[PDB]
Enzyme design. Structure first.
Site, PDB file in Angstrom:
ATOM      1  N   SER A  39       0.806  -1.209   0.000  1.00  0.00           N
ATOM      2  CA  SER A  39       0.000   0.000   0.000  1.00  0.00           C
ATOM      3  C   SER A  39       0.838   1.257   0.000  1.00  0.00           C
ATOM      4  O   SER A  39       1.963   1.270   0.510  1.00  0.00           O
ATOM      5  CB  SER A  39      -0.705  -0.022   1.331  1.00  0.00           C
ATOM      6  OG  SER A  39      -1.404   1.180   1.606  1.00  0.00           O
ATOM      7  N   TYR A  56      -1.248  -1.149  11.067  1.00  0.00           N
ATOM      8  CA  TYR A  56      -1.609  -1.721   9.779  1.00  0.00           C
ATOM      9  C   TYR A  56      -0.552  -1.365   8.752  1.00  0.00           C
ATOM     10  O   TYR A  56      -0.039  -2.249   8.071  1.00  0.00           O
ATOM     11  CB  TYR A  56      -2.995  -1.274   9.250  1.00  0.00           C
ATOM     12  CG  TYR A  56      -3.248  -1.571   7.772  1.00  0.00           C
ATOM     13  CD1 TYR A  56      -3.080  -0.583   6.798  1.00  0.00           C
ATOM     14  CD2 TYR A  56      -3.680  -2.822   7.338  1.00  0.00           C
ATOM     15  CE1 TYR A  56      -3.322  -0.806   5.440  1.00  0.00           C
ATOM     16  CE2 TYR A  56      -3.944  -3.070   5.986  1.00  0.00           C
ATOM     17  CZ  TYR A  56      -3.770  -2.060   5.034  1.00  0.00           C
ATOM     18  OH  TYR A  56      -4.019  -2.271   3.705  1.00  0.00           O
ATOM     19  N   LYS A 100       2.453  -3.559   6.770  1.00  0.00           N
ATOM     20  CA  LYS A 100       2.745  -3.640   5.336  1.00  0.00           C
ATOM     21  C   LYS A 100       4.233  -3.432   5.041  1.00  0.00           C
ATOM     22  O   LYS A 100       4.816  -4.134   4.208  1.00  0.00           O
ATOM     23  CB  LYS A 100       1.882  -2.701   4.475  1.00  0.00           C
ATOM     24  CG  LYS A 100       0.402  -3.089   4.400  1.00  0.00           C
ATOM     25  CD  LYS A 100       0.153  -4.440   3.742  1.00  0.00           C
ATOM     26  CE  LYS A 100      -1.317  -4.749   3.469  1.00  0.00           C
ATOM     27  NZ  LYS A 100      -1.484  -6.095   2.885  1.00  0.00           N
TER      28      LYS A 100
END
Ligand SMILES: NC(=O)c1ccc[n+]([C@@H]2O[C@H](COP(=O)([O-])OP(=O)(O)OC[C@H]3O[C@@H](n4cnc5c(N)ncnc54)[C@H](O)[C@@H]3O)[C@@H](O)[C@H]2O)c1
Ligand SMILES: NC(=O)c1ccc[n+]([C@@H]2O[C@H](COP(=O)([O-])OP(=O)(O)OC[C@H]3O[C@@H](n4cnc5c(N)ncnc54)[C@H](O)[C@@H]3O)[C@@H](O)[C@H]2O)c1
Ligand SMILES: CC(=O)N[C@H]1[C@@H](OP(=O)(O)OP(=O)(O)OC[C@H]2O[C@@H](n3ccc(=O)[nH]c3=O)[C@H](O)[C@@H]2O)O[C@H](CO)[C@@H](O)[C@@H]1O
Ligand SMILES: CC(=O)N[C@H]1[C@@H](OP(=O)(O)OP(=O)(O)OC[C@H]2O[C@@H](n3ccc(=O)[nH]c3=O)[C@H](O)[C@@H]2O)O[C@H](CO)[C@@H](O)[C@@H]1O
Ligand SMILES: [Cl-]
Ligand SMILES: [Cl-]
Ligand SMILES: [Cl-]
Ligand SMILES: [Cl-]
Ligand SMILES: [Mg+2]
Lengths: 347, 345
Positions: free
Chosen positions: B131, B156, B160
């Site tokens: 992302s 989060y 990643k």
């Protein structure tokens, strides 16, 4: 009456820490899978069997892997731990760069699992074994806790950094957690009895054990990894800290947890850097033996110099590294001399 | 040696990608645990049931969790995979900040378990769902792959970045591995059919679904998280990318793996950023409905503007997003309108 769980307690630092805990009146429960510890003649790892003798206190132990979910869950269900001191993991034997997934599995997933099991059992007090490697290639010296982290090199160092990060988040999300992250520098020396110490298997990858092995006569000469670094003598500089002082820093860490400190991070070092040649010299002095050596090629990823800024720990932890260079060398020599081939089962 | 394993294939991006795979002649094997996917009346998740209907091709599926070692072992024994596209994981339902362990378990431990099995079975070809959040607060725009990464906002985003790093290490250690890390920007839209699309549960955290829900009448008005940013109109700007183009980008990634590329990283964005208000307006045009809005406080940790530099992907992957704003909005509206309650109740 609540216990302290010590993971990886049969190893170098863990064994010394179990001893300190016992002497300080704590009740440890120790676990280890023997990945890098010697089995005694009995159920106890030899290191711990000796700790039991030295302290005259019983060591509660279970052979177990932190990756064994069921075993770990039963352990937390059986005891009421007030805190966990987490030493278990893989360290590099110069290995990490080559087996990243082993490091990620053992260190990262192993710790995630431990943290989950801890949470589920209502145990939210942790002392974590971190390292000065998290700082990467020093951008300045000495290294204070504010120095940037996560910049450099290997899977081992990365694993430590990711772990710190995860714990920082956990504490951020739940204020009930208390965690002390200890960034150790270069542990050396041994318990003053000379009965326990670092017991490397095979050719040691770290400096001191190699030096002592030469002094004892097991090895002919020390291989010095480069002498063209930007340091006073060209050899690498490191902050060597007596394992006993380091172990005691763990007791200070437990006390810190009791203050409901939240997430705290401290360097555990002396603040004094010594070169390779300086360590050789100190060992000659301690051993009363000449220590030959040969300069060889640089070791991949080696930093020129690294040493701590120990003030935060002195201030917040109420701890300081009391033992000097000669003490470290003398204690290392005593262990080495008395146990020429490391740990062995009782005769 | 033939199949492509698709983890989390029942999800939003994964279902569209499964469709694209089928249409391109690939044989997918999908796994999902239904954590964020709707179960149909049969074996298949509704999304996949629909994909099957749409493509007229069969969808091989197994209900399972990536955290289940045993199941992974059985899966890899049963099928011969040539590659894995890894979509499975937890996204923030604005949640990450609050429940680190769940994220770390599913995203980190889950991915590590997957990589281990892949390694065990000699399936060293991966496409990973990354992302633009990995870039952190933009230092410059547009964001190119060379922009700094790490120092992510949340558990989060951190997850990643940690995963990208582990994969990089893996590729370094074993030159036989090939991995394509795809940094998605802001996925939106839906398959042209209007039959599948994002199916959020509860109050949506993302702009687009919220917007569509206001248009359909499910929500009174959109809350605009600040209008005082240093953007042309004061509202947040993002690179909205059509989920169909994103899915196609995965096919281009598969072809890249065939080149024995080692570890490669690419942004999957349009290179065009739009503000919250521009999206609202475009949606009013697409839907023919009014979308009332109210300006509220900035959302904690929001970035003013984020958009991609799509050059490397075009040059190296040979891929570019073909669908623009109007198309995104038209497709999103169709899905929402034709399926007022998503896949089901
Ligand atoms: N020695 C150093 O210079 C140094 C420097 C920085 C940080 N550290 C960290 O401190 C900790 C202790 O280091 P040490 O020098 O005592 O190493 P060590 O190898 O002697 O101690 C680690 C212990 O963990 C055990 N262990 C390994 N994997 C396990 C698993 N899956 N389950 C249970 N036990 C397992 C090993 O058998 C060993 O007894 C480690 O986490 C290390 O990474 C050490
Ligand atoms: N949608 C976005 O804006 C966005 C942004 C960038 C990156 N991503 C990433 O792309 C991927 C797909 O996102 P999405 O929008 O399609 O989300 P999604 O939730 O619709 O898809 C994820 C799928 O994984 C499944 N899943 C979750 N945990 C699982 C587990 N343990 N085992 C098996 N399946 C499991 C869920 O049930 C779901 O169907 C995710 O990794 C996400 O983090 C998405
Ligand atoms: C367990 C661990 O964390 N080891 C890491 C630690 O090593 P670190 O360098 O701190 O510690 P070592 O004991 O391995 O080395 C200490 C010093 O002695 C030198 N020396 C050591 C052994 C020897 O046989 N000859 C010799 O000359 C080293 O070059 C160094 O200058 O940080 C290094 C630099 O990031 C990493 O590369 C190591 O993986
Ligand atoms: C800071 C941030 O990136 N948070 C998440 C958000 O990113 P991101 O902010 O890019 O995407 P969103 O869809 O949440 O928001 C897009 C834009 O719309 C605004 N907006 C959104 C919803 C709403 O009700 N009102 C409103 O005004 C936001 O301030 C922003 O400017 O979704 C991602 C997945 O798509 C996650 O990976 C990110 O963790
Ligand atoms: Cl015994
Ligand atoms: Cl240098
Ligand atoms: Cl079905
Ligand atoms: Cl949690
Ligand atoms: Mg200070």
């Amino acid at each position: 009456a609540e216990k302290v769980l010590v993971t990886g307690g049969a190893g170098y630092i863990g064994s010394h820490t179990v001893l300190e805990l016992l002497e300080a009146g704590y009740l440890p429960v120790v676990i280890d899978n023997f990945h890098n510890a010697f089995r005694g003649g009995g159920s106890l790892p030899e290191s711990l069997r000796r700790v039991q003798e030295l302290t005259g206190r019983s060591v509660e132990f279970e052979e177990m892997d932190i990756l064994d979910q069921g075993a770990l869950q039963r352990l937390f269900k059986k005891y009421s731990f007030m805190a966990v001191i987490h030493f278990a993991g893989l360290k590099a034997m110069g290995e990490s760069v080559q087996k990243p997934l082993d490091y990620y599995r053992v260190n990262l997933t192993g710790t995630i699992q431990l943290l989950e099991i801890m949470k589920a059992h209502g145990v939210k007090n942790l002392v974590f074994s971190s390292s000065a490697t998290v700082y990467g290639n020093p951008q300045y010296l000495p290294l204070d806790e504010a120095h940037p982290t996560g910049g450099c090199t290997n899977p081992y160092g990365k694993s430590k950094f990711f772990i710190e990060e995860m714990i920082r988040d956990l504490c951020q999300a739940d204020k009930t957690w208390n965690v002390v992250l200890l960034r150790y520098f270069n542990p050396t020396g041994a318990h003053a009895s000379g009965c326990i110490g670092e017991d490397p298997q095979g050719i040691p990858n770290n400096l001191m054990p190699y030096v002592s092995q030469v002094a004892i006569g097991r090895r002919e000469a020390l291989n010095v990894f480069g002498n063209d670094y930007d340091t006073e003598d060209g050899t690498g500089v490191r902050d060597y800290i007596h394992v006993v002082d380091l172990a005691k820093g763990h007791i200070a860490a437990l006390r810190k947890l009791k203050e409901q400190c939240g997430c705290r991070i401290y360097n555990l070092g002396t603040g004094t850097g010594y070169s390779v040649l300086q360590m050789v010299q100190a060992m000659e002095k301690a051993s009363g033996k000449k220590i030959p050596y040969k300069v060889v090629a640089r070791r991949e990823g080696d930093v020129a110099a690294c040493y701590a800024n120990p003030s935060l720990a002195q201030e917040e932890l109420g701890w300081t590294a009391a033992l000097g260079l000669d003490r470290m060398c003398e204690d290392l020599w005593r262990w080495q001399k008395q146990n020429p081939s490391g740990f062995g089962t009782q005769a």
